[PDB]
Amino acid sequence: QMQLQESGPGLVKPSQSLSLTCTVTGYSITSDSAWNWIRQFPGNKLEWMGYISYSGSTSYNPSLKSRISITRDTSKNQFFLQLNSVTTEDTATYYCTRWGDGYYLYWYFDVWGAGTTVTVS
Amino acid sequence: DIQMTQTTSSLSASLGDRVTISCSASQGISYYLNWYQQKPDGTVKLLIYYTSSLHSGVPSRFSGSGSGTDYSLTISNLEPEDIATYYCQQYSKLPWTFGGGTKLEIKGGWSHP
Amino acid sequence: TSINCKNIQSTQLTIEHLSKCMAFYQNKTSSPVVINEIISDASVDEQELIKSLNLNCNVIDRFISESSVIETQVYYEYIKSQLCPLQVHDIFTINSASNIQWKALARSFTLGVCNTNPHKHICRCLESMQMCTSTKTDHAREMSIYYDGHPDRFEHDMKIILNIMRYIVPGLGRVLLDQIKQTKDYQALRHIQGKLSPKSQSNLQLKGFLEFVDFILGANVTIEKTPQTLTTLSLIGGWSHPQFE
Ligand SMILES: *[C@@H]1O[C@H](CO)[C@@H](O[C@@H]2O[C@H](CO)[C@@H](O[C@@H]3O[C@H](CO[C@H]4O[C@H](CO[C@H]5O[C@H](CO)[C@@H](O)[C@H](O)[C@@H]5O)[C@@H](O)[C@H](O[C@H]5O[C@H](CO)[C@@H](O)[C@H](O)[C@@H]5O)[C@@H]4O)[C@@H](O)[C@H](O[C@H]4O[C@H](CO)[C@@H](O)[C@H](O)[C@@H]4O)[C@@H]3O)[C@H](O)[C@H]2NC(C)=O)[C@H](O)[C@H]1NC(C)=O
Ligand SMILES: *[C@@H]1O[C@H](CO[C@@H]2O[C@@H](C)[C@@H](O)[C@@H](O)[C@@H]2O)[C@@H](O[C@@H]2O[C@H](CO)[C@@H](O)[C@H](O)[C@H]2NC(C)=O)[C@H](O)[C@H]1NC(C)=O
């Protein structure tokens, strides 16, 4: 019965960070699974950016591994994406989803946000 | 790393037809694959997980299949809500990748009742 | 009566009753069951331990092979049987990617019976992976005389067969097969290979390999079990015997 939303600026022109806040309502990120950011480029190309686990482990796509950072706040039960040194390629629709670890529910992306389109230049 | 290829980029079919979407893998995934539906408004909901299994709440019309490097999604009878772009995913090992996507469109014909 | 793979009795630990706890023998093809439901009845600290392991269908075999205690290994095997059914039963579909490993072990090492008449049906079946339909029917007389009365020439081929089988049944099967190699009790292999035959009837090459293992097990020879002097790294003891339930 959980739901997630992405809260973010409309656009940032290059050489700057883009940060988004995924708010998870109805679930505890500490309890289980993996929390992911997944961006869809124009032309409907999907790319997995990375995740932070329930325990705080981080895994990033090696393409972005230098400039990408994924944090979380256990207090307000949120987790944040920061993609730095943006370029016109980074313009896209950014989602945040839940990848289930095999413990409470199987491996897949279960709940998806509506997505926020953030643009460059 | 592992490149997933959807041979058909876009497809049109009439309503009530039986549509099949193909997903190919660069290497053997050993059955780890998921199927997602992104509707036009952008809501993405899980269709199929673990290649055979159908997610809770997904209609009985969807059936997953395939093995090894080759996988298929099958919509038995096409209803208008199903018009959307479909994606396949390998969780074999990181980084996870998605298929090129397959957009469905209507033929569709005229109503003659 | 029936064995419970979640808590296994001390009397029950033997190659046969352990063989009954293998993943494929559970007859679960479909519809994976999530880890929390699998371990649902078991101590709370155990549940938290398994969650902290963060098992997945790929590396659960590594966890089985690394563990020093057999009851825990059987538990992970049962978790694999309920959690990852397609992975467990994939080997039985002919030319599925799961067969590549034991086929490669067959090509890499040649049996000693194959250094005389390399065109014997089985030698062609391991070499070229062709003419595997019935291996024990062709030349059985010659192989029957070759293996009978010789302990060493028989133990050599039996050991290589045990490695290929290690690649056929990962997880619990592997460790049981390892037991064979160390205990040099080769008839216990029946319990592993027998259960493998009915599932493998669709696979032609696997069926041929299992039929031949049946043949070479039926060779006429007397070989002595060599249980380990240490008594350690054996099923009976020591040391700990975990029971989850
Ligand atoms: C998952 O599925 C599997 C398979 O469906 C299932 O395993 C079966 O379980 C049932 C129930 O426990 C067993 O049924 C009993 O079988 C008793 C004896 O079975 C004999 O025959 C087995 C098969 O022989 C075949 O192969 C030969 C070639 O050699 C062929 O000629 C035959 O025609 C036949 O088709 C044989 O494997 C078995 O040998 C034992 O040892 C092997 C070592 O290799 C090992 O694999 C097993 O441990 C195996 O048990 C044995 O020789 C049978 O007696 C019994 O019926 C009566 O028993 C007594 C006898 O007096 C009666 O009093 C009583 O009233 C019964 O009516 C019963 O039918 C069946 O044998 C299993 N099949 C196997 C193991 O292959 C698993 O249980 C399922 N999993 C779970 C969790 O349930
Ligand atoms: C199983 O093998 C035995 C052993 O045969 C021995 O090896 C020969 C090369 C030769 O040296 C023979 O003289 C040896 O006997 C076969 O022989 C009989 O085995 C049974 C018990 O298995 C025993 O009671 C008999 O006394 C043995 N016969 C003799 C003459 O000693 C036996 O026939 C073989 N069984 C098979 C092939 O089914």
Numbering used by the authors:
A (entry chain H): 1 to 35, 35A, 36 to 82, 82A, 82B, 82C, 83 to 100, 100A, ...
B (entry chain L): 1 to 113
C (entry chain B): 467 to 711
Sentences reproduced from the published study:
The OBV M segment encodes two glycoproteins, Gn and Gc, derived from a single polyprotein precursor, with Gn encoded upstream of Gc. Compared with other bunyaviruses, OBV Gn is relatively small, with an ectodomain of about 200 amino acids (aa), whereas Gc, with an ectodomain of ca. 900 aa long, is about twice the size of its Gc counterparts from other bunyaviruses. Our structural analysis has revealed that this region is composed of two domains: a 27 -kDa α-helical head domain and a stalk that is divided into two identically folded 19 -kDa tandem β-sandwiches. Furthermore, the head domain is well exposed to the environment and is a major target of the humoral adaptive immune system of the OBV mammalian hosts, indicating that the trigonal pyramid of the spike shields the functionally more critical membrane fusion core machinery from the host’s antibody response.
We co-crystallized single-chain variable fragments (scFvs) of 1C11 and 4B6 in complex with the SBV Gc head domain. The crystals diffracted anisotropically to 2.8–3.6 Å resolution for 1C11 and to 3.2–4.0 Å resolution for 4B6. The structures showed that both mAbs recognize conformational epitopes on a single antigen monomer. 4B6, on the other hand, binds to the opposite, basal end of the head domain, near its connection to the stalk. Its epitope covers 812 A2 of surface area and is centered on the second disulfide bond, with contributions from the region around helices h3–h7. The structures further revealed that the epitope of both antibodies overlaps with the Gc head trimer interface and is not accessible in the context of the trimeric spike. The fact that both antibodies neutralize virus particles therefore suggests that the SBV spikes are dynamic and transiently expose this epitope. The recombinant SBV head–stalk construct bound to these mAbs with dissociation constants of KD(1C11) = 5.4 ± 0.3 nM and KD(4B6) = 36 ± 4 nM (mean ± s.d.). Furthermore, the two mAbs neutralized SBV on Vero cells in a focus reduction neutralization (FRNT) assay with ND50(1C11) = 0.15 ± 0.01 µM and ND50(4B6) = 1.8 ± 0.1 µM (mean ± s.d.).
